[PDB]
Amino acid sequence: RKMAFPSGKVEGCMVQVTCGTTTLNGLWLDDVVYCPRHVICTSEDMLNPNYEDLLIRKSNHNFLVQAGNVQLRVIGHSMQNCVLKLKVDTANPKTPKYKFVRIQPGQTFSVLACYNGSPSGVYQCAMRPNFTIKGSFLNGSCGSVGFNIDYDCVSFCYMAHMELPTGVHAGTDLEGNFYGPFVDRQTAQAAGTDTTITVNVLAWLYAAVINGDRWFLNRFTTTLNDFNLVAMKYNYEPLTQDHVDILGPLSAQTGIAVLDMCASLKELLQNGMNGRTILGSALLEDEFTPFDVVRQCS
């Protein structure tokens, strides 16, 4: 059971942004509303949008921002990469302590999903190696904002811009930089073949050991290079020395060296589960980071 962060601090920041007939979700922090810049495009604009030119043709009156039933008056607009910044005449009184951060594939965060024009659900996820996010099967989302919470500080890391044909979404950080080889233009785009986040699977095996689920431990230890040869065969991400270092705390806590756990994982890949489960699951979980496990399993 993966948990998301409590979403209340972000809920107070979700607003609806309308340009023409397009309405989508924006993030209201102090006196700025952040949203995908493609809100300014028409159907025909998307085929080859000149966003800088389209934006200068736009005026403050072209934007309608609503926080609940209160309209926010737009008093200026600028673009930062693929994110539109709408200066509004009112600072959000619910603005939490926050910062904008960029995460790496394999790292986890919570998504507050908007449906029918307001925040509707929250889930925990990992950014896939192919930079997409496995969201809800429900289509027609008005957008999504991804975040982590550390103490009282919300670290915003993701904003959804598009749905991909496979049921996943793709997006930017809050400075408008895309994650992955995607563009906010109407053009043929597909997620690349995805792979399993190996360092997270190892983190989760450590969680299993901490919770007393040990049947999969074996006496063997492999090498980083021998393991990666097997990992590649099974569409697992290569393990790096950095990953090994990251797992260090869990190795010290459990007494299972990383390359020792890698040999357990190699065997699980090559031979299967043999009718057993781990932490009650018949499948290996790759949406817990090492930091998630350390934090939740002491």
Q: Which does 260 bind (CB under 5 to 8 A by kind): a second copy, Na ion, none?
A: Na ion
| Minimum CB distance to a second copy smaller for 166 or for 187 | 166
- Partnered with residue 22 across adjacent β-strands are 19
Catalytic one of 61, 68, 140, 280 = 140
Confirm or reject binding of residue 220 to Na ion (CB under 5 A).
yes
Query: x/- site string to a second copy, residues 82 to 121, per CB under 8 A?
Result: ------------------------------xx-----xxx
**Those residues with Cβ within 8 angstroms of residue 132's Cβ, 6 or more apart along the chain or in another chain:** 164, 166, 168, 169, 170, 180, 191, 194
Confirm or reject binding of residue 1 to a second copy (CB under 8 A).
yes
142 is catalytic: yes
- Which range binds a second copy by CB under 8 A, 83-91, 216-224, 256-264, 290-298? 290-298
Confirm or reject binding of residue 5 to a second copy (CB under 8 A).
yes
- Partnered with residue 114 across adjacent β-strands are 119, 143
Cα 83 to Cα 33: distance, rounded to the nearest angstrom: 10
Q: Which does 298 bind (CB under 5 to 8 A by kind): a second copy, Na ion, none?
A: a second copy
Q: Kind of pairing, strands 118-126 and 22-29?
A: unpaired
- Which range binds Na ion by CB under 5 A, 39-47, 58-66, 214-222, 235-243? 214-222
Cα 264 to Cα 144: distance, rounded to the nearest angstrom: 37
What DSSP element (H or E) covers 150? strand 143-150
| Minimum CB distance to a second copy smaller for 115 or for 178 | 115
Q: Residue 105: is it exposed, middle or buried by C-beta count within 10 angstroms (0-12/13-18/19+)?
A: middle
Cα 19 to Cα 112: distance, rounded to the nearest angstrom: 22
Confirm or reject binding of residue 70 to a second copy (CB under 8 A).
no
Q: Which residues ranging from 233 to 262 are in contact with Na ion (CB under 5 A)?
A: 260
Catalytically active residues, by annotation: 38, 140, 142
Residues in contact with Na ion by the rule CB under 5 A:
218, 220, 260, 263-264
